[PDB]
Design an enzyme around this catalytic site. Structure first.
Site, PDB file in Angstrom:
ATOM      1  CG  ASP A 140       6.558  -5.809  -5.562  1.00  0.00           C
ATOM      2  OD1 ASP A 140       5.692  -6.695  -5.707  1.00  0.00           O
ATOM      3  OD2 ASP A 140       6.305  -4.595  -5.652  1.00  0.00           O
ATOM      4  CG  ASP A 141      11.784  -4.757  -5.951  1.00  0.00           C
ATOM      5  OD1 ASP A 141      11.230  -4.260  -6.953  1.00  0.00           O
ATOM      6  OD2 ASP A 141      11.898  -4.164  -4.858  1.00  0.00           O
ATOM      7  CG  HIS A 172       9.849  -6.232  -1.289  1.00  0.00           C
ATOM      8  ND1 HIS A 172       8.876  -5.836  -0.398  1.00  0.00           N
ATOM      9  CD2 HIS A 172       9.948  -5.240  -2.205  1.00  0.00           C
ATOM     10  CE1 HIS A 172       8.415  -4.649  -0.752  1.00  0.00           C
ATOM     11  NE2 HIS A 172       9.046  -4.266  -1.847  1.00  0.00           N
TER      12      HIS A 172
HETATM   13  C1  LIG Z   1       7.596   7.063   1.483  1.00  0.00           C
HETATM   14  C2  LIG Z   1       7.305   5.672   0.927  1.00  0.00           C
HETATM   15  O1  LIG Z   1       6.747   5.549  -0.166  1.00  0.00           O
HETATM   16  N1  LIG Z   1       7.734   4.661   1.714  1.00  0.00           N
HETATM   17  C3  LIG Z   1       7.571   3.228   1.395  1.00  0.00           C
HETATM   18  C4  LIG Z   1       8.251   2.880   0.080  1.00  0.00           C
HETATM   19  O2  LIG Z   1       9.657   3.153   0.186  1.00  0.00           O
HETATM   20  C5  LIG Z   1       8.041   1.402  -0.175  1.00  0.00           C
HETATM   21  O3  LIG Z   1       8.650   1.022  -1.395  1.00  0.00           O
HETATM   22  C6  LIG Z   1       9.738   0.108  -1.275  1.00  0.00           C
HETATM   23  O4  LIG Z   1      10.937   0.870  -0.911  1.00  0.00           O
HETATM   24  C7  LIG Z   1      12.019  -0.067  -0.807  1.00  0.00           C
HETATM   25  C8  LIG Z   1      13.306   0.669  -0.422  1.00  0.00           C
HETATM   26  O5  LIG Z   1      13.645   1.617  -1.441  1.00  0.00           O
HETATM   27  C9  LIG Z   1      12.254  -0.783  -2.144  1.00  0.00           C
HETATM   28  O6  LIG Z   1      13.309  -1.742  -1.963  1.00  0.00           O
HETATM   29  C10 LIG Z   1      10.985  -1.494  -2.508  1.00  0.00           C
HETATM   30  O7  LIG Z   1      11.143  -2.192  -3.743  1.00  0.00           O
HETATM   31  C11 LIG Z   1       9.909  -0.395  -2.624  1.00  0.00           C
HETATM   32  N2  LIG Z   1       8.625  -1.022  -2.972  1.00  0.00           N
HETATM   33  C12 LIG Z   1       8.206  -1.307  -4.205  1.00  0.00           C
HETATM   34  C13 LIG Z   1       6.826  -1.957  -4.248  1.00  0.00           C
HETATM   35  O8  LIG Z   1       8.749  -0.903  -5.228  1.00  0.00           O
HETATM   36  C14 LIG Z   1       6.539   1.145  -0.291  1.00  0.00           C
HETATM   37  C15 LIG Z   1       6.289  -0.323  -0.653  1.00  0.00           C
HETATM   38  O9  LIG Z   1       6.843  -1.173   0.355  1.00  0.00           O
HETATM   39  O10 LIG Z   1       5.891   1.517   0.943  1.00  0.00           O
HETATM   40  C16 LIG Z   1       6.079   2.902   1.252  1.00  0.00           C
HETATM   41  O11 LIG Z   1       5.401   3.160   2.484  1.00  0.00           O
END
Ligand SMILES: CC(=O)N[C@@H]1[C@@H](O)[C@H](O[C@@H]2O[C@H](CO)[C@@H](O)[C@H](O)[C@H]2NC(C)=O)[C@@H](CO)O[C@H]1O
Length: 199
Positions: free
Chosen positions: A15-16, A156
């Site tokens: 991703d990203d 990522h």
């Molecule tokens: C509460 C929650 O949803 N926590 C996790 C998400 O934050 C996480 O998403 C990823 O967060 C990162 C930091 O902001 C981003 O850099 C990353 O791009 C974002 N993921 C995506 C797929 O957009 C997700 C996915 O890892 O898991 C959650 O548990």
């Protein structure tokens, strides 16, 4: 070439991207003869046309990660349309193809929002947590021990450790009897529909 119902399949997803590490990541994948799925950010795509062209030409799948990584559940219908369409047009101008799948940012989605997405929503069942620890060894460990047949592994393309993790991760999955496929190949022979979420 492979029936993932027949054999143990896994989809490695990133991703990203694209970013500064993508071409070296693509080098490792090529070296390992391993296809992957890249959920690209619309806004980064414009800086990386060659690199996205390269993803297509070297057998990888491009999916949408929206334009600027916003939480779609907080957006208007207008904002969501922009997130989807700007990313599509970006990907198309750069690489000549349109994404067939979308991954919602932060995994945040819902029926009322998903209805507005012209593609299948693709989530994940293995979170390597590489975004948090940036560590290639732990990325390998989680991916490897949590992976199951049909798993979609979330990584990522934003840092060094993804480049570093791929050789070891691919090696160990292969040796365990897994075949690495794109999301598209993963879902061949299974239902895979627009506005529906799959992990
Ligand atoms: C509460 C929650 O949803 N926590 C996790 C998400 O934050 C996480 O998403 C990823 O967060 C990162 C930091 O902001 C981003 O850099 C990353 O791009 C974002 N993921 C995506 C797929 O957009 C997700 C996915 O890892 O898991 C959650 O548990």
């Amino acid at each position: 070439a492979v029936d993932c119902a027949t054999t143990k399949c896994v989809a490695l997803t990133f991703d990203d991207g694209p970013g500064e590490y993508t071409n070296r990541l693509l080098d490792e994948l090529s070296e390992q003869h391993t296809p992957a799925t890249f959920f690209v950010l619309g806004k980064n795509v414009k800086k990386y046309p060659k690199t996205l062209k390269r993803m297509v030409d070297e057998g990888h799948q491009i999916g949408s990660h929206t334009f600027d990584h916003k939480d779609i559940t907080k957006l208007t219908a207008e904002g969501i349309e922009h997130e989807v369409q700007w990313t599509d047009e970006a990907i198309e101008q750069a690489a000549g193809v349109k994404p067939q799948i979308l991954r919602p940012p932060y995994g945040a989605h819902g029926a009322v929002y998903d209805r507005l997405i012209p593609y299948p929503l693709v989530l994940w069942d293995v979170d390597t947590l590489d975004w948090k620890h940036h560590d290639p060894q732990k990325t390998v460990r989680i991916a490897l021990e949590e992976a199951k047949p049909g798993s979609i592994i979330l990584m990522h393309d934003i840092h060094e450790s993804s480049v570093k993790a791929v050789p070891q991760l691919v090696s160990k999955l292969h040796d365990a009897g897994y075949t690495l496929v794109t999301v598209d190949q993963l879902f061949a022979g299974t239902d895979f529909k627009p506005a529906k979420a799959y992990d």
